[PDB]
């Protein structure tokens, strides 16, 4: 049903907009593609944000087909 996300890093990070503003050094549009990838976030998508983000990718990973 759910699964874990970067954005929940992001809650647990309690980084706000001006916080994660901060993070989007990376092009913020790429984000929009959420329209089709509202599903968990692409690598692609997770490593901009995970690069800055203090997870491991591969802790993070989930490995779910949902």
């Given at each position: 049903m759910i699964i874990n996300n970067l954005k929940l890093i992001r809650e647990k990070k309690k980084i706000s907009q001006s916080e994660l503003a901060a993070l989007?050094?990376?092009?913020?549009?790429?984000?929009?593609?959420?329209?089709?990838?509202?599903?968990?976030?692409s690598l692609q998508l997770a490593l901009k944000i995970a690069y800055y983000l203090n997870t491991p990718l591969e802790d993070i990973f989930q490995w779910q087909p949902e």
């Open positions: 989007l050094e990376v092009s913020r549009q790429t984000i929009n593609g959420i329209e089709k990838n509202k599903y968990n976030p």
